[PDB]
Assembly symmetry: D2
Homo-oligomer: 447 residues x 4
Amino acid sequence: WTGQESLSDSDPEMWELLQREKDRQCRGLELIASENFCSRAALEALGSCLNNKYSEGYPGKRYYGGAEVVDEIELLCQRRALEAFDLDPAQWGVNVQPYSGSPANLAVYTALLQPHDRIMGLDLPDGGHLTHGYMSDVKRISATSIFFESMPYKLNPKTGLIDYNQLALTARLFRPRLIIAGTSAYARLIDYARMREVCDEVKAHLLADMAHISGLVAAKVIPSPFKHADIVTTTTHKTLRGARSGLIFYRKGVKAIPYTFEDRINFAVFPSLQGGPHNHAIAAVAVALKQACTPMFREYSLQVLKNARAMADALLERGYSLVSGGTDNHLVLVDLRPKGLDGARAERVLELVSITANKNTCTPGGLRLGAPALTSRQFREDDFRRVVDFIDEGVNIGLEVKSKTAKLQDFKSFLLKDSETSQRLANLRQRVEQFARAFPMPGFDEH
Amino acid sequence: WTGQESLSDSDPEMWELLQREKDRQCRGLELIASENFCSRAALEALGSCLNNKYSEGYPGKRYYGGAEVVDEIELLCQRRALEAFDLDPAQWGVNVQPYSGSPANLAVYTALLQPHDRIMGLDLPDGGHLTHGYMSDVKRISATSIFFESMPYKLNPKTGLIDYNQLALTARLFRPRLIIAGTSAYARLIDYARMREVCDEVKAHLLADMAHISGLVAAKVIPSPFKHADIVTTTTHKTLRGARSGLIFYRKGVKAIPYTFEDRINFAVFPSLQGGPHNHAIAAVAVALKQACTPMFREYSLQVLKNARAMADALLERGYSLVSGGTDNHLVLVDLRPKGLDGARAERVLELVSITANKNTCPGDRSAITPGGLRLGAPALTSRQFREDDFRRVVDFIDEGVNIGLEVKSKTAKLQDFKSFLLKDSETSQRLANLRQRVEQFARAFPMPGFDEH
Amino acid sequence: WTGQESLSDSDPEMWELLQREKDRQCRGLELIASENFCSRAALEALGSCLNNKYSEGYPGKRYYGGAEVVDEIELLCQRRALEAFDLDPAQWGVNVQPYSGSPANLAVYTALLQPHDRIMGLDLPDGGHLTHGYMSDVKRISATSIFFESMPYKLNPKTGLIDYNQLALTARLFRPRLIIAGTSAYARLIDYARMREVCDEVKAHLLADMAHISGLVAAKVIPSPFKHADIVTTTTHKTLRGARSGLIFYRKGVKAIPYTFEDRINFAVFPSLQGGPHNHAIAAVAVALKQACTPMFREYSLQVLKNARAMADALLERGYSLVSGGTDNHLVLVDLRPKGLDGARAERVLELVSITANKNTCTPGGLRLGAPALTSRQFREDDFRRVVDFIDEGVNIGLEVKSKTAKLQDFKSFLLKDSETSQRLANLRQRVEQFARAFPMPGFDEH
Amino acid sequence: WTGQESLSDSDPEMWELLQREKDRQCRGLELIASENFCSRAALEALGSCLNNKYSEGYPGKRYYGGAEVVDEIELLCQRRALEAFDLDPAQWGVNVQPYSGSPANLAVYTALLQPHDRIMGLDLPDGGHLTHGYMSDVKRISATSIFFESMPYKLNPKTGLIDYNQLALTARLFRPRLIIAGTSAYARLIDYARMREVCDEVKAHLLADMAHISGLVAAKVIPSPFKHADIVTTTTHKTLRGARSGLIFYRKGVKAIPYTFEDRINFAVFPSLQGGPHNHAIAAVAVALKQACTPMFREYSLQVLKNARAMADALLERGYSLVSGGTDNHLVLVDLRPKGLDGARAERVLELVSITANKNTCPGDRSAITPGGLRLGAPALTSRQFREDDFRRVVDFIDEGVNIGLEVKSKTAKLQDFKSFLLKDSETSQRLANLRQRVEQFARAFPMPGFDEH
């Protein structure tokens, strides 16, 4: 036993599973706004010998020796991270160790707040993220709401936009120490400048969680939250198209008196929260960041916007309603109530024809659809019009099964069962797949 | 642009860095007890298309669709996890999502305790882990000690063993809700049965953090903490030899009255603490777990023990002292004080001849006091097919380095002086360059798990 | 040494001080709304041999023996407490041990909430109490805000009333576990029914802190918060006219399923927070409660309302503005801004002519004036008109010193200094005193 | 209605209750170590017009006007407080507002610690106070243990003294921010100097809660904790013989660098925790403090010690055991186990013959186990002019009661049985009625501080 044997030879069971998954990805239409397809280059770094180095600490300040190279990698991941977002090193620092997006947010909170200090984020069903704070009537759900004290701010249900006015009123009272600007399911640009005014007034930190939109920001096809925020967090996947990992950016040098984010943020990541860094992820992230500086990436990102517009327009033009009436980014939010349907139903139908989207709250009343993934497969505007055509076939199949049944559980039975419904689906699936398989796919060919 | 281009073509700067690192690993003698070399099979899964699936939730209970296959992978990773540790599914469950070892511990604490509830772990300089709780005189260091209230238990410095007697006395007073049995730098077996008695008495949960020893346990070459613990956490690297990731195991079904670990543990992992699982890691872990069920792995684990013994004996034979006098596991703790040196010096010398070990605090020392010891481990080199004679040879090189360090110390005052002398004094440079080159020539000859080039 | 010697004989220094204080009270016009003059009967109990008994625990469940009598006293204080507020013993319980008003509130919070649980009270400068929660921009001030998490609700600055609408909006978000209805400086009735609707909606406890108005409630000259609240706290002084002490009332027996307030409330008082009860205070309180059941007390309380009305009207009729335009209770809030003055100035002038009132926030812009004390000295409506006349003389002296100076520190100098100001004051003082000394005074004659 | 009418006229029901209580106190033998009988002078201040002034804030810094006189009273109460304990105003400050002893402790903790910070006090059944921290296996009991994190230190059951050695060991681990030296049921002097060494080492505040012994300290018949503590709390009753109220003393001026106790302590009292001060109590306290500076008070305090000795000796002489073998203060702890009885039984018998004492837990016993001991104190009867022979006589009556209890125990099984037999069996009733009547006749003869009638 050398540990040099191939996965296909040593673990055929697992290899078959990887191949089934690759085929599923290759044949399907991926419309989850959070997803993307990672470059082969980045995956080669991810599966490298970098997994075998423990490097607790920071470059030049490691617990253990033998880190010359890993130090260079991490410092390079930092530089590339600052370059990708057009940041001055004298004004901004970055931490590249967080294992994912959620860990990065916790590290910020633990670096800057005391337990039980106050935080505000966009309410979850209004399109925020769990990590921004969330509790039901009966219990604390996010760890953020267990260790800290969170109160949500809300959408204006008329405009579908963030009620900035209510935020200011409500934050004058609750007095949060940290306010979070960033979203999971919102189709428009955030008023970073406004949030900053609110934060300046009540003496709070402004954190921007750009996970969804980091690609768009790096490409400069939308305004940057770095003009206005103290701290920025993000995933390295989603629109940045990297491996799964996380980043924390922070202001440094002179504030007025220095900024004091740097030491606290790094200390909270390590030693307070994490163990050994995942150097193979750090390296893949760095590869993804280099890719994001390119003109190619700017084209990709522009195309992301165009394809989301195109998908929006194609849906309007078939009489669907869109929350906020459209989009200024990479996703669209479809209100299936004025079309006599709901996310739960739609999602399950689409799933069965190899189209993957989310139900989303308004049995909830909406659907979220995103462009970044298919765009990465070189989809253009006509291709997305065609996608909508397939979606609409599926909605109309759904609508038909709803008038022919009562409850959600009923609705799902009727689909796997009634042949006239089964065939209409099998036919549609097969067309979707044939259409999808024809487009290219980032990554390795076989796994 | 397809995103199908190779790393050597698209990012030569990064590719050159990978290659420098691979050459470093190939040419060096890796004695850090936490390290291992991961199989090529596992790394292929890690760098797979599984990176591209969001699967928040659990199998059959996902936020989103399109998870048929990922569900099968995760369930398979679970089964293989239970099988690797010889656990009945009716009695034990497992969560395979934690991103690493440290997150796995936090999830347990948040699942089972209220903020500010009480925890005890082995004091850090006595050989515990940060995640078990740690604060200096002046500040809270571990997030475990910020969100929860931690008090350490200690080694008996006379025996170098864990003072179980003092633990019971001290836990009767402090009244912890969770006691943690597991170590980072301890050369002996833990009395899980005893800890359990203490936990039963004061009404605390017993958590076993087997990160260092999980390989040994899976191979059944040492006793299992699953006989005595309620909850078991571990990394998937170290002696399990997987990709970097984490596991939480927990009792389920009937206690006496049911166990209530399952729902709380899974809930704390997700939705409370984590986002999307890292399915590529989950898959690599599963590959590593399959490998750990094999006879080959049992041979490997036995050999790990024998090589640590052999290294121990070779050090005794040259008049070094070992904390607790030896080892019953994969590591040895070497006391360099009686020999007129310290970990800080030794470590830096060894580093400069491509041997990597840790300085380590010796029992009864207030750290600040520069550490009097060195920790050395067998799992990594054993994975490169080292046998007992190879480790005897490793000790020869170590001893050469110690003796060099000894000479530079007689010619120097302070630690800062000592480090510059190694770079500056040319007679010292050469003696080091000579030794380095012999270490490398010796090391490069042994095989290396992974890919050849990166 | 017997310990039977008189205070005048054994401690002349102290006795002189008591006599100076009694003369000050006898000669002055006491307009602080929180104050009253306690009955001689109640003071005799307060200075009794009951100080010499340790009775930790509750009747029949004492740590120590020899408590037959003290048990009877405490049980009697309970019965009289329930009778005074017209409460059914099967529906309400009471705890009579809290050492004062502030301790009673803490005991409720600690009995019913976890540390860091959420509370809302009327903001302090809007006329709430410290114990309801209070923090500045920079620090936690109330212990309530240290051990628990408090967010204030506010007045509508247009109506001078409590913004019930904003409360509901704001409590839907903050999700408090306890909401507190009660005031220190508010001239109107509280919508207990409305607060209850809000509490029912967000699943919170309603606590009513009737400290200011407990006399009025007992007398049934205003609506009772007992119709709507789960828990009621109060001082035993202020309008109840007792010795300094506190009470906690709580619902008991069947809710729908039993109420669980009783055991938690009593346990928090003792053993959790307090030591030995103050049996002499408990006994004085009981004497005061018996007095409050009488027709005499109902007359007194009606007269309190009439005299506050009369004082209001007399102020309107001299062109002062009143927050909320008047009063439905025992106090009035005078806005000295539309009269070109401020509380800080006015208070100090009045003080120097033996009239005691408070500055109150709108250098703040108001003054609070209360009726209960002077009413207890048998003052009637004409007497209060006459009081206002003296007040107005003082305001007009103030106004004159303001146009003749710059800052507050200046203003205070000018008064003790300039003879033409000094004499005008000495003259006024002497008239005030001569007028006041003529009225009777509850208590002992000499101390 | 003037509110000038007498209590006997306006509330005969209440007046009759006061008179029953006064007769009870006059006729009984009060041996509860916490009790005393307050001077008439102090009670006159307590029931004064000072009840009618709101004076939130501090002298010269009041929310409201009209406080010229109350300011003079409070400042005077401060001066007399410092004088009574022989303290330099440049070195010590005092707060005179706390409503009682328990509030004074809470104010100190809230002034100096963060929520969830760590505190150690003498374990409750080892003779500590609730306010020093206390939790059962299953719940937090003291508010001190809810808002803060408390761990007890313990008696050495072999000596009956405080295990200072174990305190140091245990505090090195738990790392408290505040350690509390003071007791409710302890018969000996506390090693303030030792506690201070322990506090200096681990960087904790030393608080002394002298509630039980403040009279003795003021009289200088025992060593002062002010030589060693940073902060001192006390009640104003117990051995100081005042009205029920509380004090907090604190170091001020230069430490080495200034002390920062003053502003925090005063702020926590008000505005953080309390409302309006109880000026009538403040004035009574001041009266009591003046009385405590006198020679008369020193004689009283000396006599307290002698009478406790005398009671101790009289018990030894009749073959009882005393925890720690005797006393150096105002109380004695009697172990009734070797005599074949327990506190629970003894207490109830003594109660029925108008002698009031406490059952009290004996060292090394898990309470639940019905307490094996009795606590007896001298301050109250000494205030009724009892001398040594009078206390010898008290012990005679106690012993008669013990012997009665012994007979009812041989005729009964359980505690519940034992209590009903005392009411029910007529031969037992009479033996008790006889003894009661002799105790009363003996007690009524001694004078009583206070008013005659109420």
